[PDB]
């Protein structure tokens, strides 16, 4: 994505294939990207528990730029994730769960 030109946090193609090949599903892939791109939320302080993707249900919103990057990487493997209903119904829930879980 040319929009991301100059960013310092992008993943190479070989890296993306590695991470996907060691994941158990496209949703799991998205969760591991979540934990990788928001490291300050997955420490022993578990700040992740205050967040979800939308800022719904009284939670704070996860950075939309990094979520946009995760959806971009997912769309590379799952083009139907370019559809907003697919992204909402098949990914946002799993990301919110990764933020929320015990």
Curated annotation (Swiss-Prot):
It does not alter association with heterochromatin, but is required for the repression of transcription. It comes from Mus musculus. Homooligomer, probably a homooctamer. Interacts with HDAC2 and HDAC3, but not HDAC1. Interacts with SALL4. Interacts with SMARCA5/SNF2H, BAZ2A/TIP5 and USP21. Interacts with the nucleosome remodeling and histone deacetylase (NuRD) repressor complex. Interacts (via BEN domains 1 and 3) with ERCC6L (via N-terminal TPR repeat); the interaction is direct. The gene is Bend3. Residues 6-102 form the BEN domain. Transcriptional repressor which associates with the NoRC (nucleolar remodeling complex) complex and plays a key role in repressing rDNA transcription. The sumoylated form modulates the stability of the NoRC complex component BAZ2A/TIP5 by controlling its USP21-mediated deubiquitination. Binds to unmethylated major satellite DNA and is involved in the recruitment of the Polycomb repressive complex 2 (PRC2) to major satellites. Stimulates the ERCC6L translocase and ATPase activities. The BEN domain 4 is necessary and sufficient for the localization of BEND3 to heterochromatic regions. It is found in: Nucleus; Nucleus, Nucleolus. The chain holds residues 547 to 643 of 825 of the full protein. This is BEN domain-containing protein 3. The lineage of its organism: Eukaryota, Metazoa, Chordata, Craniata, Vertebrata.
């Amino acid at each position: 994505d040319p929009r991301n030109s100059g960013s310092d946090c992008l993943l190479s193609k070989e890296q993306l294939r590695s991470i996907y090949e060691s994941s158990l599903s496209i949703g799991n892939f998205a969760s591991r990207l979540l934990v990788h791109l928001f490291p300050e939320l997955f420490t022993h302080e578990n700040l992740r528990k205050q967040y979800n993707c939308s800022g719904s249900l009284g939670k704070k919103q996860l950075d939309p730029a990094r979520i946009r990057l995760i959806r971009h990487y997912v769309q590379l493997l799952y083009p139907r994730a370019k559809n907003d209903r697919v992204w909402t119904l098949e990914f946002v829930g799993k990301l919110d769960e990764r933020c929320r879980r015990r």
